[PDB]
Every structure is written in structure tokens, then in C-alpha cells.
Amino acid sequence: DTRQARRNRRRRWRERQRAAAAR
RNA sequence: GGUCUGGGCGCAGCGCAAGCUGACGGUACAGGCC
């Protein structure tokens, strides 16, 4: 893995949870 | 309407050296399919 991948990935998790949380 | 992957740039912080990191930027950028 790399910082970007983690960043790119993490952004998914956070944002993904965003839909659920917001939803 | 949805899903999956990640690469590099800036800034900041720590150190005899070397070396890493930030639910930060970036809700950014890119590509594919149903």
C-alpha cells in the first residue's frame, strides 16, 4: 500500500459512511 | 443511479542520521462496467 492508496481508500470509507450516516 | 482501485502534489510536524505520518487539502484528479 501507499499513502495515496490509503488516502484515496480512506476518502471512500469516510465518504461512504457519509451516505449511510447522512442517509 | 451505483461500485471498485490508486497515483502524485503542497503544507506542517519530529531527528546527530535515517525515516514516516496527518477521518488534512481532497465532497480534489483518473479509469472501467452494469
Swiss-Prot record:
Function (record text): Escorts unspliced or incompletely spliced viral pre-mRNAs (late transcripts) out of the nucleus of infected cells. These pre-mRNAs carry a recognition sequence called Rev responsive element (RRE) located in the env gene, that is not present in fully spliced viral mRNAs (early transcripts). This function is essential since most viral proteins are translated from unspliced or partially spliced pre-mRNAs which cannot exit the nucleus by the pathway used by fully processed cellular mRNAs. Rev itself is translated from a fully spliced mRNA that readily exits the nucleus.
Name under which the protein is recorded: Protein Rev
Additional facts recorded: Isolates WMJ1, WMJ2, and WMJ3 were obtained from blood samples sequentially taken from a two-year old Haitian who was perinatally infected by her mother.
Motif (Nuclear localization signal and RNA-binding (RRE)): 2-17
Transmembrane feature ranges: none
PTM entry text: Phosphorylated by protein kinase CK2. Presence of, and maybe binding to the N-terminus of the regulatory beta subunit of CK2 is necessary for CK2-mediated Rev's phosphorylation. Asymmetrically arginine dimethylated at one site by host PRMT6. Methylation impairs the RNA-binding activity and export of viral RNA from the nucleus to the cytoplasm.
Comment text on domains: The RNA-binding motif binds to the RRE, a 240 bp stem-and-loop structure present in incompletely spliced viral pre-mRNAs. This region also contains the NLS which mediates nuclear localization via KPNB1 binding and, when the N-terminal sequence is present, nucleolar targeting. These overlapping functions prevent Rev bound to RRE from undesirable return to the nucleus. When Rev binds the RRE, the NLS becomes masked while the NES remains accessible. The leucine-rich NES mediates binding to human XPO1.
Quaternary assembly: Homomultimer; when bound to the RRE. Multimeric assembly is essential for activity and may involve XPO1. Binds to human KPNB1, XPO1, TNPO1, RANBP5 and IPO7.
Subcellular location: Host nucleus, Host nucleolus; Host cytoplasm
Region (Disordered): 1-16
Domain of life: Viruses
Feature: compositional bias, Basic residues: 4-15
